[PDB]
Design an enzyme around this catalytic site. Sequence first.
Site, mmCIF file in Angstrom:
data_model
loop_
_atom_site.group_PDB
_atom_site.id
_atom_site.type_symbol
_atom_site.label_atom_id
_atom_site.label_comp_id
_atom_site.label_asym_id
_atom_site.label_seq_id
_atom_site.Cartn_x
_atom_site.Cartn_y
_atom_site.Cartn_z
ATOM 1 N N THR H 30 43.560 39.840 43.251
ATOM 2 C CA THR H 30 42.527 38.893 42.860
ATOM 3 C C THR H 30 42.625 38.595 41.362
ATOM 4 O O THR H 30 43.375 39.236 40.622
ATOM 5 C CB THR H 30 41.140 39.434 43.214
ATOM 6 N N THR H 31 41.854 37.607 40.915
ATOM 7 C CA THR H 31 41.964 37.095 39.555
ATOM 8 C C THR H 31 40.952 37.767 38.639
ATOM 9 O O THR H 31 39.805 38.007 39.028
ATOM 10 C CB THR H 31 41.755 35.578 39.505
#
Lengths: 244, 204, 240, 250, 242, 231, 241, 243
Positions: H30-31
């Site tokens: 994920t970011t």
Amino acid sequence: GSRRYDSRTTIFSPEGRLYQVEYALESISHAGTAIGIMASDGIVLAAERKVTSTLLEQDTSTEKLYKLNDKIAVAVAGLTADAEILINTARIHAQNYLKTYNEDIPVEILVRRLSDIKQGYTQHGGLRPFGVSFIYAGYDDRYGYQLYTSNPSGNYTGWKAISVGANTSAAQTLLQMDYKDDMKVDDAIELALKTLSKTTDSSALTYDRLEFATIRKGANDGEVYQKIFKPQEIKDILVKTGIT
Amino acid sequence: SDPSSINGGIVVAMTGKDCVAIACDLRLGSQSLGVSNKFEKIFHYGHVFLGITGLATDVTTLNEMFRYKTNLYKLKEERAIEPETFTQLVSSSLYERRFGPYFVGPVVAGINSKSGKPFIAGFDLIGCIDEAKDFIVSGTASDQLFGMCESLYEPNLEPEDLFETISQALLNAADRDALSGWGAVVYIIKKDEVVKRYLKMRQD
Amino acid sequence: GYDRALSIFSPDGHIFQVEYALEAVKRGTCAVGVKGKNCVVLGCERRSTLKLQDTRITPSKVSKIDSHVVLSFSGLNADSRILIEKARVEAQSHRLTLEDPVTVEYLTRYVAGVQQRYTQSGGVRPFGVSTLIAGFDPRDDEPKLYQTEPSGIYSSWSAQTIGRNSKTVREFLEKNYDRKEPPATVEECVKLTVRSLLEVVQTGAKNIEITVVKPDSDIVALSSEEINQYVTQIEQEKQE
Amino acid sequence: MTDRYSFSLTTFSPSGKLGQIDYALTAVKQGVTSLGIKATNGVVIATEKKSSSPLAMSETLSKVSLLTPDIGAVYSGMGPDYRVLVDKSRKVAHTSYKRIYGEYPPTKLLVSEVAKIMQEATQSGGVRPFGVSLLIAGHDEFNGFSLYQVDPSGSYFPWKATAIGKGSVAAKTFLEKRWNDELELEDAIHIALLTLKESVEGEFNGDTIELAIIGDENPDLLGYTGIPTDKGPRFRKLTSQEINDRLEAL
Amino acid sequence: DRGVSTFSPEGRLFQVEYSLEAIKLGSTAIGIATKEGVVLGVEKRATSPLLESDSIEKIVEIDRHIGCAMSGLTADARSMIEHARTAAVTHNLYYDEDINVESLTQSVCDLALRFGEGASGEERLMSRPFGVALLIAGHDADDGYQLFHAEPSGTFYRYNAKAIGSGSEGAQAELLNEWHSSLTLKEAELLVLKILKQVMEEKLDENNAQLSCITKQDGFKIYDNEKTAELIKELKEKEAAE
Amino acid sequence: NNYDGDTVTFSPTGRLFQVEYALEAIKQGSVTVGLRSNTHAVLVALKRNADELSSYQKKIIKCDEHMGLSLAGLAPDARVLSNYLRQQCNYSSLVFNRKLAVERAGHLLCDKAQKNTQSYGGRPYGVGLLIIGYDKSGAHLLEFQPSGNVTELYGTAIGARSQGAKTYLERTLDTFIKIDGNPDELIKAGVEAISQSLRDESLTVDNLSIAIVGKDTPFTIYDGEAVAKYI
Amino acid sequence: GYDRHITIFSPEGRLYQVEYAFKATNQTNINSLAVRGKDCTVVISQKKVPDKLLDPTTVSYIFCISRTIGMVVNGPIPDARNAALRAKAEAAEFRYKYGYDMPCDVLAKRMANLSQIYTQRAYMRPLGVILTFVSVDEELGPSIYKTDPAGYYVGYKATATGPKQQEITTNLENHFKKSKIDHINEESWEKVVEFAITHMIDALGTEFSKNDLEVGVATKDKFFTLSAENIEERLVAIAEQ
Amino acid sequence: TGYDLSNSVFSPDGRNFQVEYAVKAVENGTTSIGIKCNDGVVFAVEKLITSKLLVPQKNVKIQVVDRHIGCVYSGLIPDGRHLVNRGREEAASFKKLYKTPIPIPAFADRLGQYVQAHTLYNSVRPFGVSTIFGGVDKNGAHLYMLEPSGSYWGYKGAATGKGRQSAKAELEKLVDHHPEGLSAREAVKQAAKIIYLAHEDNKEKDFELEISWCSLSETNGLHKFVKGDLLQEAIDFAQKEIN
């Protein structure tokens, strides 16, 4: 991780044979021949040097006949470097036995220990075994004169005359032909060189290509005298027998 | 208890003119009671002589200790060890057990082969080198020998005169001591040969 | 310390390293054991291939573990001098703690155990040795005869054999040995071992060694002349 | 983690050779030539300092080393593998023989300890044999002057003179013609320069040739003059200026 | 060579599936747990005439109240029984009582996971898992007679009757019909003995089978070959009675 | 493949096959379903048995007086991670006199699984856990994966054909979380939840295993004839 | 053939794992220079921040190993951090055992032996870096010692490391055959920084901003790096001439 | 090749293939981003909602080290939680031995050496995360990013994870428009906006925003989670920009 690179040296092959043991023997048939003839009152050790030049120092040299303590010598066939580690634990073990009993170690015990150390190197640890075979030539009071050989297997046996190194088939055939049991140290001297003139790769046998050694009951008192011949005494013994 | 006076004994060594002599008494006690008169203090490895006094059990351990190291030495280098070297070896072996020492006082005597120079050396418990050109003493009556020897000694004695001196030195100090006596042995070391003489002394 | 797993199961349910140890027992020279009314007899085969040996100081294949227990082996000679050493050490260890000699079963189980461990330790290959361990229980007369294998199984036998061409000499024993009524005297038992070993010796009279163990700590190896005597009598029985 | 490097990398091959050790000796034949001549009153050992650039200074780098005050060395093969061996050897002369006898080892005994470091490098687990051959010159009082060659298998032999490296074949045959037993120290040096001039294509002068003798004793390096029982080094390395002088007298 | 703790794409451990094959080479054992006591019977299998069939050890006392019959590689079993015998004796030292069979069996199966390569050498001790299965019968104060099947999978089930070894799946299908709670101890003794007679390659006699039981009162008794010969004679009579 | 030998190896795309295989081991196991409200937490468990004569295997482990888990997969590995949680629950109660918070127990498992798949010569664990418990801050339900990830959920299932019960619980999410103060109705919502995953093997009174822990309820297990009320 | 996966002598005598390590170093397109003055050593190194997000000052390749040995590294930056942490520890340890400040020679010879150990054992890869130590020794004056992933090290009148080293090497050779000394003569150390920069401009063919250089000067008593203003001062003084 | 089968084996290219595959494990995660504020730092993380069963705001994937360093990672959550756990021991034994909170530039080296050690030996896996950590100390703000090589640097702004191509460009807009320094209160608004835009690749599943910050003026140098009115005010700025 490092599972890939394992040679797994110590496992049996499908036939029941240890691969690393069978090879080490083949390696040992390349080292120069060594011969032992046991007579009634002494032992002869004659080994054929390997590597020789007019530019090699020979007199101080010592590459195949080592002294262990007062009354026991060996002859090396194989990797001279590998052997030099097995000769140092033989000496240590000898004097340690003299430190605990006040007796010169029996020949049977000093042999049995170097075979356990060889065996224990194929049992575990994944190390390649030593490429050495010994001719233990020794004298105690229990049985008199003894000869023993050991092999990278560990197994050892006693002999009245034996060969290791090159042409053990050819050298063992001559020795069975001429051996006798009433022999004396001076007849055996003659036979040991006579076998080495025929098996030699040389065009001619020569004093500078020999390491020679006797253990004689002979010499003052009952004590035993071990004598590694000088390079000069070998030239005399080689004219005496008339090979040159 | 004194870890040295359990057994006693005395050793004395002298130089002469191209020869040495090392001599001692043969008693072995357990304090008052005398046990044995056969006990010898002087051992030889090659042509070097080592006398060791003190706690009787460490005399036996330290004799079989040094026979071990010199046998190994003689197999590698292929010659008996020289007295000059061997003296470093005694010293280093002792100090190796600095704490809880062997209770002894070794004495070296021999003739160095290459040079012909006679050589003697002394020690103490931990292990310092006492170097002398005169005579070395050791043991429980070491006070009595030091005074005895210094009066008699004349530098340069011939081998058969040296044999008289080192006798008077050892005989008198033993009968003025309460831990020595019961015979004595005297070695005379020359390059060619060694001559060992047992002494007739008093049994009081 | 070396860690690799030299012994793993194969998809078929066998450890391959144990099956190969058995093959190292086929090459070894023959050992045969026969137990009688009140004695055991251990007979070993010796090589005649090797000649000019010194027969005095050749290490026999019969070793004595204690005063009244003998162990002979077939297979790798090198490996066996380790088992023999641990057995002896165990035999005296057990005389300090129990204040008694070893029963012949307790020395068997212990050798079998050292063999078992060596097939589930990482970094160690198995032994290539089967043994026969015969003897007499202390304060008793019966013969006990046990066999171990490099797997670790052990069990008691009346007569057994291991080493090279053991099927032929086992088949001889399966119809000759009367199990309800043991062989009678000591001599007739020795005659049976020498007969059994002559089927596979491919000529040899000074290649058979006999050691007999009788009760009350009597172990005696027969001299060459006494064995030669039984071989001559067996050659007259054959001829018809 | 469980590092499993216990199994040795060297194994016996089906042909009776020790594979890794054979290869090691190829790389020793690619190293730079070096030679030693043993005379009546000394040894000389010499080599060419290969300078990889003109910016590099091969003065700071050394291919000849002091091991004790009387035992020098020179080498053929891998630079690094050499430097760490000289440091084990300097150490083990002291810890295991000088403390506990009070004397620098005799030459033939040090070689035995150095042959024991090679052995352990090819026996023990997870290591590769060394990539060098040493020549070890030295003097001790009972055996005189002696010269030794050590291999990366562990074997050592005493030589009357010898060469190892690229031009070892052409050097050993030129030494047998010019060698005899009468050689003094001065003549053997002149036979050493001729033999190196065959095998060196590039520069051949005092800045690029390293030459060192075990010879007569020196009381000028002694450093604490005023004591007769000492005698000082027997090893002395010839400087750059000395070496150009034996080229005028070529 | 495929690792020792490598999972297969199926989501299992290679070595544990293999060892499951090695249990089916062993010789058959059968147990039937009733409310009077459990009955264990093994097929011994005399491998020759010479063999003394009376040294085949396949039923071992673990304590007064815990029997055990084993099948598979009996060699690997010498080490399990040593540990069990110790664990059972320890608990009797530490708390002065007998241990429930369910607890002793937890201890046996804790050895059986210790196979592997470790990360520093912990409490690992094998190169491979165990090749032997146990049928641990016994009796404890709380839950009457139990009977567990300890497997080298590391998991034990409690069974009412189980048959392991060479003829397991044929025998297991015949127990599945015949077991009920009526069985007195005489009926159950004879029942084990009869299912062993179908899967044994040789004829049923007292020199290649062995019976045992565990009762609360007399403890764990291995039957003598002379007792069993009376029950071999009761089977022959009742199967020909029809 | 080639990269599935050891767990030391990333594959050419980044995946760790040895860790995805360990995941498989949970799809072989039996279904178990866990749900919770604010007052109580519940595990409904399908116990599996072998042949007829076999008895059913216990899928519910009591860890302490306020915390327990159920397993799905390798029963030998569950007993190795529950032994390690037992020591932690004592180690807290002796040194801090403090009931061990569920949020922390999860992060300890996370750390222990990671060290065991990085080491050469380890093996991933092949078992899933639903860990329920009641501490100072209320009720929790954790899902443990052999990857390492600890996730806190309202409900979840794991095992074979879990998908049936996982769906059912996300439709009914608003209703079974508002069942506060009635332990009896939260168990009934969970029995229904496990009947979506069941295809064959109708529930029995020796087949079903229920655990419930809460605000006023030490950790208790219902076996045998004690689950006749909830079928 | 497992000889290209661990360090064992190949069938040919090579150590393929080591020959590979050299080509791993030259990949950052950083070009380093080190020339000696009369009483100082100058080292100038290219700095290349790729994206405007990276902070300019934290990017660096000169490390301060002690108080007088600076070390400029050429290679990937994690191995450099590894080689730097270990060198700092030795310069401390030295001063603690022997009570004087580790001369440069001694440090370079210590890292060399540490490098060798990794090409002898089968369970470590060699480091992927070329280390260049620069100092004003106490005894031998200005010094440079450049060390390699084989273990080899050697002294230097001046050195250059990087992909485009061939241009700088041949430029330095020309200057020392003209002047016939081993070291840039000019007396002050600012004139030797000027000299270093001018030979970089010629070799690479490109001029420099002040953000593209990072400069390090060793005089007796201190090693320091120069700030962006002290670099700007040199750059403007070269453009004047 | 075959230079990829095991770790820390060089190839002819110099590449260390095992480490290159590790970077692909980070790009899967994920970011996350970090803004270096004028006087502090702001951290933001995209926590994918996988199911409606997940409890809201109890699976917080921002972890604090000591009491003034925020760490947030992308990739494999276990690998990271072990890197952070180990970082806490290094920091607690610094404060034990010198009795001063560990400087952020120092804490960066200690974490690097521990990663880097896992590409020397060939029997432990490389780490499968990229960590963005930092905080405030005596010098001021620092922001660092750590890769599976062992390579770290200072950053004005940093971003990793799937949506990093998007976010590096967006971050760059905020550094060109404010050389003066994006102030601490302004950066909480901007952080949320960047995460909402970089979430357009993952726009399949809803996500949850979580911000935290360490700021010299605001919380006096500690580390706290932005929460309540201030997190809600940001979420509203972010919904207003995308629509």
